[PDB]
Structure 1
């Protein structure tokens, strides 16, 4: 089997092309680059510049006003680890609501950036479901109108793990990002013309094991954008089916919700260790 990370045009997928190839990719690899999805280096420049300017020239008062009282990295500014937790790296997060913006121009640029990412993530997830003939409990659209989280970081840096999202979209700017493909770590360089997609555990779950959730990590001067498309707490699934594809669930009953499985706080990643 080719260990190459494939590339798919969203437009072409939406037209019913390369369905067999798409299915094989999802099953055997669970990751691919996506083009023609409305996201390129162009849309990124604007957001990167404005936020980077903030991480460098924003004062403490300005950062404080956009910092959550709890360091959860859910909304606003965060200094992630004498000195400051910023020494290692800084982060900016946002979602569909309850955001913290430092200025008007920043808000406009990022609200639009977030929207393109959300639209693209929903679109590719929609094709993931169609290619596997998957109809989530409660319908496709209700499943896709969910709880996304966008994190932008600015600098092994990150330990091996898999994501618990439906799908995760990544934009980057030495190749630090590595993913397991064909039983070996493969480089995942930047593609100014595309976004990198990682399938998460929820894709595996909802499709009944038809999609792989690949492990990946970061080796150790770069910025990355990570968009997690996460289901709603009440997303419902079959317990026996989860067991049939690898989930070591401790759930009584025939059906369960995302909340029942993961708990009352979103968990984005999981280390196999």
Structure 2
């Protein structure tokens, strides 16, 4: 099997092209670069510059007003010095965001919207290619709880798989590596595309038709990670979950995402 990380044009997928190739990719690899999805280097650049600015030229006070009382990295700014001197982060979602100023909010709301739109659209194709209809319908499933995290830096990360439906990654030596065909392959930047990692929820909802590839950071740079995560009430078949590898401890025939993962979102699971 070719261990190459494939690339797909979202527009072409929406047009019904490369359906066999896309299915095979999802099943055998669970990752790919996505082009023509409204996300390019330009957009990244705009949000990139304004956030970096804040990181470097932002005061401790301004950063304070955009720092959550709990260091959950869910919203706002996150960090003998601190760990920001190791890496700084900025997170946001559909609501309850913390923006340092006018120009920042405009650029980042726009950026998030594009990321969310692309994520839902590719996730939509993942569902169609596998003939999947989530309990409660597709749109209810995709109107979910995304989380966008941007990190600016000055092994690093253990091998894990994501627990999202899909995860979209943009970046600026190749850091990120993912397991393909039984070996960790390089995942370099593509100014013209976004890197897509399928997560465990894609595996679950499609009844195991989608692989959730393990990945990690090999030993300055920025990364934008967008987790498309299901709602707490996303429901699925327990017996089906058991059929594709989930070691669930759930009584009954049906369960929710909340029943399975608990009361706090968990984005990754080490492997």
TM-score normalised by the chain length of structure 1: 0.98
**Aligned residue for 2:191?**
192
Secondary structure of 2:125 counterpart: helix
Deviation of 1:88 (Å): 0.9
| 1:85 positional shift | 2.0
- Tell me the matched-pair count: 270
User: CA–CA distance in 1 between the matches of 2:152 and 2:106?
Assistant: 20
Please tell me whether residue 60 in structure 1 is matched to residue 60 in structure 2: yes
**Map of 1:36-115 to 2, 5 A cutoff?**
36-79=36-79, 82-115=80-113
2:125 and 2:12 map into 1 onto residues whose CA distance is: 11
Residue 269 (structure 1) shift:
0.3
Can you give the 5+ residue segments of structure 2 that lack an aligned partner in the other structure? none
Write the distance in 1 (CA, Å) between the matches of 2:45 and 2:86.
23
Offset at 1:36?
0.3
Q: 1:84, CA displacement in angstroms?
A: 1.0
Question: Who is 1:30 aligned against?
Answer: 30
Deviations 1:199-241 (A, max 9, x none): 0000000000000000000023100000000000000000000
Deviation at 1:122, TM superposition (A): 0.1
Match of 1:7 in 2: 7
Q: Distance in 1 between matches of 2:189 and 2:49?
A: 17
Q: Which runs of 5+ in 1 are unaligned?
A: none
In structure 2, distance between residues paired with 1:65 and 1:33: 36
Q: Normalised by the size of structure 2, how large is the TM-score?
A: 0.99
Task: Please tell me the root mean square deviation across aligned C-alpha atoms, in Å.
Answer: 0.5
Q: Which runs of 4+ in 1 moved over 2 A?
A: none
Post-superposition Cα deviations, 1:153-191, rounded to whole Å, max 9, x if no partner, equal 010111110000000000011001000000001000000
